[PDB]
Amino acid sequence: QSPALIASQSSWRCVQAHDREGWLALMADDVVIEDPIGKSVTNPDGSGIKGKEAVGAFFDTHIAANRLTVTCEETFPSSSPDEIAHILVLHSEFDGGFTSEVRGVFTYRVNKAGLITNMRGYWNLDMMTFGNQ
**Which spans of this chain sit near a copy of itself (rule: CB under 8 A)?**
36-40, 43, 46, 76-85, 87, 104-105, 107, 121-127
Which of 4, 90 has the CB closer to ligand HE7? 90
Q: Which does 131 bind (CB under 5 to 8 A by kind): ligand HE7, a copy of itself, none?
A: none
34 contacts 55 by C-beta, under 8 angstroms:
no
Closest distance of CB 61 from a copy of itself, Å: 17
Long-range contact pairs involving 31-34 (C-beta distance under 8 Å, separation at least 24): 31/55, 31/115, 31/116, 31/117, 31/118, 31/119, 32/117, 32/118, 33/58, 33/118, 33/119, 34/118, 34/119, 34/120, 34/121
Residue 110 CB neighbour total at 10 angstroms: 24
Closest distance of CB 21 from a copy of itself, Å: 29
Piece of 24-32, 47-55, 61-69, 72-80 that binds ligand HE7 (CB under 6 A): 61-69
Q: Which does 68 bind (CB under 5 to 8 A by kind): a copy of itself, ligand HE7, none?
A: ligand HE7
